Write a protein that binds this DNA or RNA. Sequence first.
DNA 1: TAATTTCACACCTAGGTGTGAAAT
DNA 2: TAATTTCACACCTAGGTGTGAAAT
Lengths: 184, 186
Amino acid sequence: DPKVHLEAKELWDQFHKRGTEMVITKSGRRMFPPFKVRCSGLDKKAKYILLMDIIAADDCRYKFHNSRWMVAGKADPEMPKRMYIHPDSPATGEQWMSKVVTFHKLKLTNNISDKHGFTILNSMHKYQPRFHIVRANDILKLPYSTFRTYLFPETEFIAVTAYQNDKITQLKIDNNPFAKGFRD
Amino acid sequence: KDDPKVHLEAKELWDQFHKRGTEMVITKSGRRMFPPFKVRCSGLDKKAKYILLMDIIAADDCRYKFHNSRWMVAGKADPEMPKRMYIHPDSPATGEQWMSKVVTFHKLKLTNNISDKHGFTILNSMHKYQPRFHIVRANDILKLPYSTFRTYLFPETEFIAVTAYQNDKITQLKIDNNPFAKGFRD
DNA sequence: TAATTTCACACCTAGGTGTGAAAT
DNA sequence: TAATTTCACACCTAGGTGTGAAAT
Ligand SMILES: [Mg+2]
């Protein structure tokens, strides 16, 4: 049975315990931590296509009040979510199992008319990253193939235009090399 | 049915290098070409899917030497390695998509490491090379070994690979035109 | 309306330049 | 052999960070 392992799980757990937030911007923001995985148990010679997308975790809009995230009401409408085909697809099980799998092109935006293929999200809504394995050797075969979808609830997050919980901001500062200029 | 037209971008700059005898530095870690090979396509079927590619092949079977300020054939070429065929990352894509932007392979890299495992283009120093652009009307990467390639040659992009510039006039053009080298501008 | 969104900044990482001289 | 290949370096490009004041 193919199995998927989340990389840097201890760090995802630290963020998740405090309520993960991801900033979104018109021009596109990277996710931090990045969503990275390792696959095992794939048939070595069979061909697979690896993909990832982000979907709404529920149909609620949230607000951060009294130091907590709470559902404020029903969610705004959602845009179709970019499905990313990993650039090495299709590749053999062997090939996929010898590398950490990540999606470098992924970026989050709040611009609903974005034309860059970014993942479009509603600020103050909750999202769940999903990883997919499809046993097929033709990208065009994707609309007729079964997707095995791997969910890691510890990577769930609320999208925001600016951080709400300072404890999340501190973890981002202390762990993302690009933000080290703000470290004490 | 289409009627492709391939236009070389920044030809004026390519001509300036070509008139002096273009050289491209190659390194173990991989070196970008400058000028980068960029083109614009017209005449594609707007809806059809195309795969666009590029590779660099030997321009002849000679080894060169730069002496008395001139490039001259020194003898027969050394054996060559297979050459990374670059599939443009945006591939596959519709004809309309392709015609809506300059097609650049500025990320392709040149190396002298015959054991390279990065997919870089492997060249022999002091040998002459010709970049090639290819258009494939096919909607899947796996059908390339069997698909028909239309190949476009631009002789003005021919260059000799080196590990260090030989002709100081070429070094000056690289300095004066490549933003990454502007620190060396007068 | 209060909250949320935007933007110019000063840093940060990653990595593309030819140089000058050592190493082959 | 004498020329070619290598590499740390200063100086660059390119883009990823949160900040906090302004705008909505
Ligand atoms: Mg571990």
